[PDB]
Structure 1
Amino acid sequence: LFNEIIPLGRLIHMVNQKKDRLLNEYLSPLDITAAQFKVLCSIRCAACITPVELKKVLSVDLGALTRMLDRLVCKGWVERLPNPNDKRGVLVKLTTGGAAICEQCHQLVGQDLHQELTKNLTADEVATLEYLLKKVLP
């Protein structure tokens, strides 16, 4: 692995891959799926967002989103309200319980990933990788 020249793009891929695999593994015992968790974190950040805008942010099939949003409402984690800047549409936001669920999860997974991801590079120091990864964003 350290004897092969793998281009950054693929490495970022492989690592994101791993990151998600760990995520699924951490949510495996909980009554919620990785996808449901992602949809909650995305609606949260935006406070209120349209399903279509949410559809664009997640890069997902609209059909699967609709069923997804309905499942989330059934779980009492999401609710729909009229869109002010419109009238033919709605917005979806988290219900109080949904918000709590999203925070219980966000905290736990965030505490297991950091460890697992940093489990062996710590010496080289997460701060350095983080530093260089920032130089890629602007």
Structure 2
Amino acid sequence: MKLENQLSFLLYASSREMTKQYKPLLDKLNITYPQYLALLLLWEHETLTVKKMGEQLYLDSGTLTPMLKRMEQQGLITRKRSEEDERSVLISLTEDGALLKEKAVDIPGTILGLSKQSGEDLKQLKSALYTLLETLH
């Protein structure tokens, strides 16, 4: 029952350690970590309701609103009450937010190399984590 033999703790700790590995690369784009993840969601789907936005990202309305608020100011996104259902809000990407992808494309390779983990070890780690994540859903 050692703390470090618990898979739940191992996932979370590694989570913290990996994240901090971004500050250096993201400080240049001004972006923070959560904003970076939201951006990866947006360069992929262009438009998303706020429900799904926090849904797949695990972010509470408390740390979701200030984030978008800053992105809007930066001109990375744009809100819009849904006309199909006023009860929801859509978040679209601006051509400024889309052109920002040009200089992020290399962040992944960099950080993956900064983790000192290489080869298929990372490919299997990821593969297993996705399966696990899919299972618990």
Specify if TM > 0.5. Answer: yes
- 1:60 pairs with 2:56: no
Could you say what the CA RMSD is over the residues aligned between the two structures, in angstroms? 2.9
Q: Which has the higher contact order (CA 8 A, sep 6+)?
A: 1
Work out the CA distance in 2 between the residues paired with 1:124 and 1:89: 42
Following superposition, the deviation at residue 83 of structure 1 comes to 2.1
Contact 1:52–1:62 under 8 Å retained in 2: no
Unaligned runs of 5+ in 2: none
Cα deviation for residue 132 of structure 1 reads 4.3
> Which whole-Å CA distance do the structure 1 matches of 2:118 and 2:50 have between them?
40
How many equivalent pairs are there?
A: 132
Separation in structure 2 between the aligned mates of residue 135 and residue 59 of structure 1, nearest angstrom = 18
- The percent of aligned pairs where both chains have the same amino acid is 23
- Partner SS state of residue 99, structure 2: helix
Normalised to the residue count of structure 1, the TM-score between the two structures is 0.72
Per the normalisation by structure 2, the TM-score is 0.72
Deviation readout 1:63-111 (Å, 9 max, x if unpaired) = 4433322221111110123524313543111111102214522x22201
CA–CA distance in 2 between the matches of 1:39 and 1:26? 16
Q: Is the 8 A contact 1:37 1:102 kept in 2?
A: no
* Larger of the two Rg values belongs to structure: 1
The superposition leaves residues 23-46 of structure 1 with CA deviations (integer Å, 9 ceiling, x where unpaired) of: 223212332222221222233433
